[PDB]
Amino acid sequence: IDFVYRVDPNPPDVIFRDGFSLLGYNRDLQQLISGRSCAGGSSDSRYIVTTSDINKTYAIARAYYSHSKFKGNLYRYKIRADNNFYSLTPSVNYLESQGGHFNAYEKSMIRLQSEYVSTLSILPENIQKAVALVYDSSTGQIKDGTSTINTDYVSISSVSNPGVIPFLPEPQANTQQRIDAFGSLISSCFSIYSVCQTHRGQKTEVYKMPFYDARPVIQFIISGN
Amino acid sequence: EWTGDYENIGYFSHEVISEFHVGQIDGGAYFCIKAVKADGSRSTPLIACSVSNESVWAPSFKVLLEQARYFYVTEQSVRIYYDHNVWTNQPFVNTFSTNALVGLSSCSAATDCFGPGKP
Amino acid sequence: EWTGDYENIGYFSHEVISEFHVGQIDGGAYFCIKAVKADGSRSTPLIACSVSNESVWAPSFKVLLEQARYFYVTEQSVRIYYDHNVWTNQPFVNTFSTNALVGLSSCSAATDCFGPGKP
Amino acid sequence: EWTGDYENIGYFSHEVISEFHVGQIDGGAYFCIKAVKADGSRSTPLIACSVSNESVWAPSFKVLLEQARYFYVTEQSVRIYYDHNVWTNQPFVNTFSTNALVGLSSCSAATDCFGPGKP
Amino acid sequence: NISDYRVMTWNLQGSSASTESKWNINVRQLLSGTAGVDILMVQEAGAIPTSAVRTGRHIQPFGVGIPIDEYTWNLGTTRRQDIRYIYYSPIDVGARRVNLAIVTRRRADNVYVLRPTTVASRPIIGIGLGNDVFLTTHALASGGPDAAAIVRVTYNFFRTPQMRHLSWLLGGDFNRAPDRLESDLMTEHLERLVTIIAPTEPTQIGGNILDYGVIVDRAPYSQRVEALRNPQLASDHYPVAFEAQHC
Amino acid sequence: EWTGDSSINYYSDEVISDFHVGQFNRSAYFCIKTVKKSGEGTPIIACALSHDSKWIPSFNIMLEQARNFYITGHSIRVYVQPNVWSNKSFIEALSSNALVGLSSCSTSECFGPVKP
Amino acid sequence: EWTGDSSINYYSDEVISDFHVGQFNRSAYFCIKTVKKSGEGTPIIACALSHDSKWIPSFNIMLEQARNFYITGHSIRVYVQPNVWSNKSFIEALSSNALVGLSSCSTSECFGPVK
């Protein structure tokens, strides 16, 4: 899906010059879906997770604007999905064919998050638009603000690559490990510190999002209640 | 009668359940949802409640709870069918709305939503 | 009876359910929740219990059980309605409290919570 | 009867539910849990059973069964209350325990454990 | 961009006719595993691992007309698919001493061949994946007077307007300590344009601090990538890696 | 008089795409709209009323299983008995079929009763 | 009756791969097809009915636990009593076994009435 979205607290002036960068070198697709390699554990994921649904951006913004400890201005960035963007289900199917087990607790967020992961750092030329998200504290509503347009964006025609992520590490045993999540069952890889926030040596000092285990929350909707 | 009357039951599409409340009123078990437009547009809530032991919309209380509890923890696009002027308790009318939660439909983004709709 | 009869039912806003307890007393199931301020300030931890075979708030017991559980695992900020001086058992009133869970509301607004409120 | 009678209900703190079993005995659904200290401080694994039909602790079956099934997926540290010498069936005792699950409390910080304790 | 790939130099430093064994053992230990090197910058290689397959696809090439092969060396067995791509230039198949090569994990979208403004010199290869260009080089062991020259030519070749957005890093043996290189870059007023990344410990048994990298500054997150020495394999030698600083 | 009867039809390799709950005359209907996994054919809509139809005892279990297969996105096989609900406004609105069985399905072969 | 009488036989180190839900006759039934995690084994099919069998009280708990042990791919030990269902069309289609117990299997010992 072309034009995927990412929520970033940095101003457009920073992300239109640097862009989104990889947080490490972990290419495992079993630690990125459960978020143990993104922000809640040994954060070294070799991915930049971006949502394809416009509604997930508002869910992320509402999860950061409702803790009273976060001070900043969030921006939704629209990113043209080139051949380096992969959906998470085609690769999960391949990892299952190779002999790996993704339990329902993870298949039930591969659907919820609508992830389209980028295996390489997002170029500033892929980001087309940045929409400020303003939080009316009295009303408790997040609404779109000034939609700045990048003058660096290169308008080529491309779509997200349909297929398996290359060089995917071999699966592990069925660990049944922690699935880190925040807000309204938003993956921990969508958090602020799931990408390199050290822009030009300077570190963005914002709230560290507290994560909760999602297995109880999914067992709470998948089993009635 | 029926959730999709379209004559008595109104329906707001592409909503997200942002606030959830549970409690008891008059020996029952009521739960209320605050529905706001996904892209911050209408700027006014859609407070809709459902009391377990009162009204003609009572036999579908539990079935409407388990699904609301699903549209709140995930905050997916939802089409809410409500019945207006169902609650008579004036304080309940004041803090909440008169609306009664009647139906919960799943919206597959886009501009279409599964369920009864006006032609 | 109602959860928002303020003059009688109190409530603590912007709380988080940090500890959960489940058990049985006098032939009736019960659960207790411990809440501390989400803002990080200091306040004596609120303890709210709900017996299923006692008091006038039993019809909502299960409704308040599946919700208090969800607000526990998620750690979401929650307004917690309660009625003071409901439980009489001295061994019970000492380890837990005399408060009774009568309502749970989501306070994901950082200013106020959806539901009844004293004016 | 209460899960803090202390004069009977004994608790093991900072447990974690490692094994879960379900079945039927004598026309009644039963579930049993095996708890091992999260700090591998050894201790004969604690096995606590619960039968829906038999025993005094019947009304808190589905409330405990759905809390031993939620503290198991989370692998969260947990205090487990049991009533020693409850089950009489020799084949049932010889495989699981004489223990009867009566209370499931959440524990946190390696200190404290919401619930009835004994000083 | 340039910080997404795990790059390492791995000069051979010939050990009395151990080229095939050192190639096979060392580079297949290095490339394999979860922490395997994505782009490996082997310089002065010469010979071939004797397991590289033939029948590479045709190359134009672009800019300079010396053919570059694309040996598809499969590290894994028949069941596995761990094939690499060694782009190698048969500049001297009778000497096997200065001949450069680059072994990567995926097929290079582009390849390059650039030489300094001096005619007599022989080009520093370099491949490119998408917008990230990894250039392989070789200097002269008599002090390396052409290091500043090769940085200069790389800059004036990648400053072309249609190639301005491309990020580049340069690695190999420079045969000159980094401090002198940055000193005579500051003399030539090229201070803030290229960064020099080197480990803080000597890279040779003789105490030399060679075998570092020079990276274009305008590349996004260029300060993220830092050159550090690998842990002690104790194989009488070691290569440098350009890792990414933890955020 | 069974999920695997000859009157009951079934569709295979299907995923529950849309969900709906509600009330129809003293009952708690729930409807599911499922489509082929990759994609083909018209979407198939199946409902189940709480207090109407022979399929009354299996309302709660089918509701729970449909929600489980909807949250997970599992490729499943849906059993439907055509022409069960008779109101004609339910029929224009959602469907006339009745959900009678849900089975988790796999790559090529999968579980559940199958017609000869 | 009990899950560990003797007439009830168990299969250990099995994972629930396929789940089926339906209605047999005035009663809701659910079936599970469990295969060995290590492989090389005949899948075992176990079914339970709400209103038929001596195993009526344990229908809901077994349904919930079979859903839970199917969501997670945890190795389980399935207890079945053969020849509980009599409708030959039902046995031909799914099985003749009766789900009467589910247990969690840690490497080596499983939790349950071993015999």
Author numbering:
A (entry chain B): 6 to 230
B (entry chain F), C (entry chain G), D (entry chain C): 1 to 119
E (entry chain A): 5 to 251
F (entry chain E): 1 to 116
G (entry chain D): 1 to 115
What does the publication say?
In this study, we identified and characterized a typhoid toxin-like A2B5 toxin, designated diarizonae toxin (DiaT), as a key virulence factor in Salmonella diarizonae. The DiaT genomic islet encodes two distinct B subunits, PltBd1 and PltBd2, which exhibit unique functional roles. Through genetic and functional analyses, we demonstrate that the heteropentameric assembly of PltBd1 and PltBd2 is essential for cytotoxicity, with our data suggesting PltBd1 facilitates toxin secretion and PltBd2 mediates host cell targeting. The holotoxin consists of a pentameric B subunit arrangement supporting a single PltA subunit, with the amphipathic C-terminal tail of PltA extending into the central pore formed by the B subunits.
To validate the structural insights from the cryo-EM map of the endogenously expressed DiaT holotoxin, we recombinantly expressed PltBd1 homopentameric holotoxin, PltBd2 homopentameric holotoxin, and PltBd1/PltBd2 heteropentameric holotoxin in E. coli. Cryo-EM analysis resolved these structures at resolutions of 3.05 Å, 2.61 Å, and 2.94 Å, respectively. Additionally, recombinant co-expression of PltBd1, PltBd2, PltA, and CdtB in Escherichia coli similarly demonstrated the presence of the heteropentameric holotoxin (S1G). Notably, the heteropentameric holotoxin purified from E. coli exhibited an identical composition and assembly to the endogenous DiaT holotoxin purified from S. diarizonae. Structural analysis confirmed consistent and distinct amino acid differences that enable the differentiation of PltBd1 and PltBd2 in the endogenous DiaT holotoxin, further reinforcing their reliability as markers for B subunit identification. Three tightly packed PltBd1 subunits were connected with dimeric PltBd2 subunits to form the heteropentamer in the holotoxin structure. The stronger hydrophobic interactions between PltBd2 and PltA, along with additional polar interactions involving PltBd1 and PltA, establish a finely balanced assembly that facilitates the stable accommodation of PltA’s C-terminal tail by the heteropentameric B subunits. Although PltBd1 and PltBd2 can individually form homopentamers, the heteropentamer is preferentially selected by PltA, likely due to its enhanced structural compatibility and complementary interactions. All holotoxins demonstrated cytotoxic activity, but the PltBd2 homopentamer exhibited the highest potency, approximately threefold greater than the PltBd1/PltBd2 heteropentameric toxin (DiaT) and nearly 75-fold greater than the PltBd1 homopentamer.
